[PDB]
Design a protein around this ligand. Structure first.
Ligand SMILES: [Ca+2]
Ligand SMILES: [Ca+2]
Ligand SMILES: [Ca+2]
Ligand SMILES: [Ca+2]
Ligand SMILES: [Ca+2]
Ligand SMILES: [Ca+2]
Ligand SMILES: [Cl-]
Ligand SMILES: [Cl-]
Ligand SMILES: [Cl-]
Ligand SMILES: [Cl-]
Ligand SMILES: [Cl-]
Ligand SMILES: [Cl-]
Lengths: 264, 281, 57, 138, 264, 27, 57
């Protein structure tokens, strides 16, 4: 009766079902966990918000078209405005979190296409001016739940002030490496003939036990159309991709007044 | 420990189908030859010794070339040629950098070696006595020299090495000195959070590891005073990571670097040479 | 203080090491470590996959 | 400070810092004072209602003359750098009247306190270096 | 060495000291606690924010003058805008909390005066129009950290629409009972010759295990000058009263989107 | 030998007042 | 004559020392001495002070 295709995930007051999954990935074979006393750093008693924040938050959906080049988000950035997770994040200097990432995209037995879904530690991307290096604004690096998109062209700016955004060039993974090698990162593929969802469970990954969430994104989430969407009755059709993410084993230190980042 | 031996196997006619899988799962293909052909037994005595991380990184690699001179300097520009300072990094060159960047994080001790060479600037100004060099490691915060003979070179606390020209290349070990639990080769973030309505500039700020990294400064001088003959020197700096651990593998750099970041250059983003046809042997 | 260890074999024994310095950072290369676990990258799946079985059932 | 001078022979520091305050008004002066430490990354506190959201102590002036506020070790990195550095910024220490200082007549209405700093037993330093606090002509 | 006058209270990242206390009150002899399984009601796993919210928050100070008639606050209303406590309160339908209330007022050995400090369960107060009964607006009932003041006169409104606030008449405790009997409620007195602070530890008190914090205040805090402030060199002098309150054993159920109450 | 570890501790409400002292003593 | 002692740990053993000279002044650095007693400077008081107690009673 039980199947690699059928799964339920419950966190807090939220549950996901899927009937066309393809197993699930646990990044680097490691489930998230709380920070042990023998690896701890800040000494204040941490806040562990548990069910208030460790639950599924669904981002705005994006549309997959035959011309789409792909999508990216950063974490914890994408969830910074999400319920009590966002509040705990911004009221504290320090935070750590794992995640369950659930990417959703259904179609029909007559559609075709394949999405690569990658979780990338320290997903540093190229800037869009050749007058400077590493020249990206905080606002452009941290778009929040809207994330960003890839392009198949690189057109760096004429003036440095106008190029302070990512050059998210698809085939170079926005960072000077070939996209065909992205499979070295934890990943699944949503191949429409096979499955309608991808599930990745991510431990906290960093060179530190805990860090400043408002300064530093630990993971990138990349969705690339490896094989273009095609549907014979209407090649211009669009199907939604929906991203739902739950923080896990969240832990925060260094409580004070709330952080309100710059918006422009 | 050795790489895998091959077992003796014949054919099959079976409901067991190891040739098929579903890579949508995130698993790579797993099948081996004995799953899909008849195989003989072959004992494999070969090992993966030379691809351990210690073996892969077990080389001294040149990471920069510095220049210093010794002559009677009468201008500010020429006075600044009597010593040099260099922010310690592996991004001046490409080879070691690319190898390290197979990984997101690392932890290692460092062997540093130096190769020092000289030439005469001209031949009508006599000769020069054998030169002694001082290479001083200046940790972040320690005072940096503004002249080749200022007080900083007394180096009471900073480590210095005094090298005599013609002697064996000098060498020292450096521990793992990171302020985190590993070095980060990539840092997807900033050094501070810019806040709502603050007056701090947001138009000329940077992104990533360059905003947070600081491994101090190497300062080099010729200790000797000037001879009538001007001598120009190069100091090549070599790094070997040892006692190495690494985490979180990455695709390697596919296109030229253009600086300390991950940025790429518009005229150099076409690494593949097109094949004539998909059927080209 | 002397450690005696097997050499890497050549065309056709043991060797001796003594550490001379008080800091481990001064030591020569770490001994060959043949540890590996490719599955953390090649098969990081939650539910075990048996090769001979269907990947999706 | 003595701590500061020692720190400038090192590159890295870690641990908790102790700030002890001695009230030097008259015995007849009373008061309550808020002392706060706000870990970094948010608007620096310039009002009591922001300061009191951080680590803090309310000091009641009285027979025991002195009060200790701790800046506990709260950091992303395992060590901070002994230089001005955004990445290893330490946060903000502030002080406000919780009530006010009150005196009766015939008593000074202005006075002072002294602030002291020292390292806690969890504190250590690394990476010896020359200080920028001493030099000579050449 | 140890003394009834000298106390330290630490909750979360916050500590209070006093050197002129007068013991401390534990209301009805009961320390606060979490909700036991055998008395529980909502069945979702609760959020227990612990140190993020269970810590001392200091309200804006008020000035005690020779003419002051007194001050009131309600709880949890007074803390509704306080850090992570406020966020947890408003993101959930249900909440419960105990409190440590620390009232601070120092002067000199030459000042005199006495404040009664009372914690009142279900502190229902009279409205200010005789055209209606129980006719008080939500906004006027829930002033937040500013609280309200008592008056020594009762002047009900000419029109019902203008009297939708409390008639906080001091000697009737704003509710038709004589103020001299307020001592049946948990209380301390700040008598300037004796002490400079009052400390009251309050358990959750209600006819339910847990309730809607945004609808219902469990406690009133009343500060009444029982003996007027007097200071011979300047009878018009003012001394601050500062109120600092820590939630304790906070527990929340029924997570959803954030409650944003009406402001006018 | 190492620098000091930090013990697990919760809050207090007590006549023990380690936050106050008197540095006049020379301590 | 050889002394074998623990090294200071690095990124990821013991070492051996032999003294070659007849004068101890010739020897390398003294071994790490972690001795300390901050109280002789931080609390040089005649009568014991218990932290939790009043400093002045
Ligand atoms: Ca073998
Ligand atoms: Ca076979
Ligand atoms: Ca199979
Ligand atoms: Ca909790
Ligand atoms: Ca210890
Ligand atoms: Ca004491
Ligand atoms: Cl957002
Ligand atoms: Cl802004
Ligand atoms: Cl010198
Ligand atoms: Cl010379
Ligand atoms: Cl309020
Ligand atoms: Cl409204």
């Amino acid at each position: 009766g039980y199947s690699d295709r059928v799964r339920q995930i419950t966190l807090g007051n939220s549950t996901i079902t899927t009937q066309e999954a393809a197993n699930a990935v646990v990044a680097y074979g490691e489930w998230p966990s709380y920070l042990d006393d023998k690896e701890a750093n800040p000494i204040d008693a941490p806040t562990e918000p548990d069910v208030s924040s460790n639950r599924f938050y669904t981002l705005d959906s994006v549309q997959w078209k035959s011309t789409s080049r792909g999508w990216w988000w950063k974490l914890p950035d994408a969830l910074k405005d999400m319920g009590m997770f966002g509040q705990n994040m911004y009221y504290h200097y320090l935070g750590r979190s794992g995640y369950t990432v659930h990417v959703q995209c259904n179609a029909s037995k007559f559609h075709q296409g394949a999405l690569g879904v990658f979780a990338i530690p320290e997903y540093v991307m190229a800037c869009n001016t050749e007058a400077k290096t590493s020249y990206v604004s905080y606002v452009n690096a941290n778009p929040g739940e809207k994330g960003g998109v890839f392009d198949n062209a690189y057109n760096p700016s004429a003036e440095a002030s106008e190029g302070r955004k990512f050059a998210a060039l698809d085939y170079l993974l926005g960072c000077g490496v070939l996209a065909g090698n992205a499979f070295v990162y934890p990943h699944q593929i949503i191949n429409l003939r096979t499955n309608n969802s991808a599930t990745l469970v991510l431990p906290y990954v960093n060179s530190l036990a805990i860090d400043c969430m408002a300064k530093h994104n630990n993971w990138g989430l990349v969705i690339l159309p490896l094989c273009k969407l095609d549907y014979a009755p209407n090649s211009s059709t669009e199907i939604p991709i929906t991203v739902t993410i739950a923080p896990m084993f969240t832990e925060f230190n260094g409580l004070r007044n709330i952080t309100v980042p710059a918006t422009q | 420990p050795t790489a895998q031996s091959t077992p003796l196997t014949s054919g099959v006619n079976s409901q067991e189908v190891p040739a098929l899988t579903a890579v949508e799962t995130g698993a790579s293909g797993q099948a081996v030859p004995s799953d899909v052909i008849e195989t003989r037994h072959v004992v494999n005595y070969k090992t993966r010794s030379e691809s351990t991380l210690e073996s892969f990184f077990g080389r001294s690699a040149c990471v920069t070339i510095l220049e210093v001179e010794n002559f009677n300097a009468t201008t500010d520009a020429d006075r600044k040629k009597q010593f040099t300072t260099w922010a310690i990094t592996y991004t001046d060159t490409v080879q070691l950098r690319r190898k390290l960047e197979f990984f997101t994080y690392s932890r290692f001790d460092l062997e540093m070696t130096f190769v020092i060479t000289e030439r005469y600037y001209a031949s009508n100004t006599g000769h020069a006595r054998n030169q002694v060099y001082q290479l001083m490691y200046i940790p972040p915060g320690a005072p940096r020299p503004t002249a080749w003979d200022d007080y900083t070179w007394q180096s009471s606390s900073n480590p210095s090495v005094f090298y005599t020209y013609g002697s064996a290349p000098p060498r020292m070990s450096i521990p793992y000195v990171g302020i985190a639990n590993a070095y980060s080769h990539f840092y997807d973030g900033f050094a501070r959070v810019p806040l709502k309505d603050e007056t701090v500039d947001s138009g000329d700020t940077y992104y990533g590891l360059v905003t947070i990294n600081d491994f101090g400064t190497l300062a080099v001088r010729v200790v000797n005073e000037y001879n009538p003959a001007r001598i120009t020197s190069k100091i090549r700096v070599y790094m070997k990571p040892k006692h190495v651990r690494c985490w979180c593998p990455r695709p390697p750099r596919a296109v030229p670097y253009r600086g300390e970041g991950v940025d790429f250059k518009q005229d150099s983003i076409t690494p593949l040479t097109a094949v004539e046809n998909i059927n080209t042997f | 203080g002397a450690q005696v260890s097997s050499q890497k074999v050549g065309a056709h024994v043991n060797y001796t090491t003594i550490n001379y310095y008080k800091d481990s950072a001064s030591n020569a290369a770490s001994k060959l470590d043949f540890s590996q676990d490719p599955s953390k990258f090649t098969e990081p799946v939650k539910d075990i996959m048996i090769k001979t079985a269907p990947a999706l059932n | 400070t003595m701590l500061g001078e020692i720190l400038n022979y090192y590159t890295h520091w870690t641990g908790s810092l102790r700030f002890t305050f001695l009230f030097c008004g008259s015995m007849m002066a009373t008061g309550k004072i808020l002392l706060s430490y706000s870990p970094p990354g948010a608007k620096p506190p310039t009002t009591r209602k922001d300061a009191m959201l951080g680590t803090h102590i309310i000091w009641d002036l009285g027979l025991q003359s002195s009060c200790t506020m701790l800046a506990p070790w709260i950091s992303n990195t395992v060590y901070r750098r002994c230089i001005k550095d955004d990445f290893t910024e330490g946060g903000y220490i502030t002080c406000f009247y919780q009530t006010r200082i009150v005196v009766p007549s015939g008593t000074p209405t202005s006075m002072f306190m002294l602030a002291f700093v020292s390292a806690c037993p969890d504190f250590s330093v690394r990476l010896l270096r020359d200080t920028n606090h001493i030099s000579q002509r050449t």
